[PDB]
Write a protein that binds this ligand. Structure first.
Ligand code: DUP
Ligand code: MG
Ligand code: NA
Length: 326
DNA sequence: GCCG
DNA sequence: CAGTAC
DNA sequence: CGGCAGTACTG
């Protein structure tokens, strides 16, 4: 429940500008600050009141003060005019800040420019084709139907397969940007080489319409990122992500795929302070790092049969999916 | 941008 | 590898 | 000063 709309809305514009211009760390600090403000019980009113909140420092406090006194924020007036166009371009799935800036430098200004003149990767041409649809969020009811479509095709050739929708869906959101389906098998073996069968069952259905990321050649494929559409009238194309994991990694894979992203990053950061390491595969202990925080020794994987175990081993109180937006 |  | 994405 | 999460594809 945000009690600081006047501040955050202005800061969000600044954050996105830095983000789309490639200033990733400056944008990160803004994100942390902006959210911290979203959580503060009351309207911040003093410069000193700003500083007290974790994630807000001198420079951010000064901008808050400027908004409180002026009603405007000077920096917003000197945002480059490239920014709306950079944002337009990097909302193409598969194009990031580097591609957007290259396109801009080549003189492109519109998606029509991109369509007719830009060189597109196979991913980007798919992203552009679905530009509007990928910017839409679906109601969670539709996410349920998509999960069930995948689960049916998976359990059709192995009833032992376990399928759960994660991401925003498992965090209880009303709408979902995509559907994230985690698949595993409680015997630790039969999960192997099933992207092959699953993806083909979903193609023969006509359910999958485009593949973005799908390394089907080597046999150790971990993820499928693609595009699906439910049958019948009134249906939009939706983004679909599927991961298949060993049963031993279920808790960590669940935790990762449920998110939020900032939640994962906070948790991973905490583990690092404890000489541990957390990934989608495993929670590890006795991890040896150099002075730049870079792993140089692998450490021991800890047994983590459930999500609660991960929290426990990290010395943290358990948090339900709905409580993990930050 | 923030923070140790 | 750099870029992009989850 | 310098890290800011830790991974998996693409070409
Ligand atoms: O940078 C990321 C992105 C995603 N993730 C994890 C968390 C996230 O909840 C999960 C699913 O990725 P999505 O892109 O689908 N985000 P989410 O489902 O939370 O929101 P949306 O409704 O936009 O799909 O992957 C990360 O750990 N790091
Ligand atoms: Mg999602
Ligand atoms: Na993009």
């Amino acid at each position: 429940t945000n009690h600081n709309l006047h501040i955050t809305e202005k800061l969000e514009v600044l954050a996105k500008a830095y983000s789309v211009q490639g200033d990733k760390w400056r944008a990160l600090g803004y994100a942390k600050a902006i959210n911290a403000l979203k959580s503060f019980h009351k309207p911040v009113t003093s410069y000193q009141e700003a500083c007290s909140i974790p994630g807000i420092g001198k420079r951010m406090a000064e901008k808050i003060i400027e908004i409180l006194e002026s009603g405007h924020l000077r920096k917003l007036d000197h945002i480059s005019e490239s920014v709306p166009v950079l944002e337009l371009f990097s909302n193409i799935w598969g194009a990031g800040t580097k591609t957007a800036q290259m396109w801009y430098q080549q003189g492109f200004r519109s998606l029509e420019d991109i369509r007719s003149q830009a060189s597109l990767t196979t991913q980007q041409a798919i992203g552009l084709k679905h530009y509007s649809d990928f910017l839409e969020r679906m109601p969670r009811e539709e996410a349920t139907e998509i999960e069930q479509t995948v689960q049916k095709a998976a359990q059709a050739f192995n009833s032992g397969l376990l399928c759960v929708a994660c991401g925003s869906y498992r965090r209880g959101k009303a709408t979902c940007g995509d559907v994230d389906v985690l698949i595993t098998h409680p015997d630790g073996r039969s999960h192997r080489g099933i992207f092959s069968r699953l993806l083909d069952s979903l193609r023969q259905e006509g359910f999958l319409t485009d593949d973005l990321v799908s390394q089907e050649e080597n046999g150790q494929q971990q993820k499928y990122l693609g595009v699906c559409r439910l049958p019948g009238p009134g249906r939009r194309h939706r983004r679909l992500d599927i991961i298949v994991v060993p049963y031993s990694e279920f808790a960590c894979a669940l935790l990762y795929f449920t998110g939020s992203a900032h939640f994962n990053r906070s948790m991973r950061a905490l583990a690092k302070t404890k000489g541990m390491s957390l990934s989608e595969h495993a929670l590890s202990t006795a991890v040896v790092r150099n002075t730049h925080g870079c792993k140089v020794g692998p450490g021991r994987v800890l047994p983590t049969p459930t999500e609660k175990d991960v929290f426990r081993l990290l010395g943290l109180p358990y948090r339900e999916p709905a409580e993990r937006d930050w």
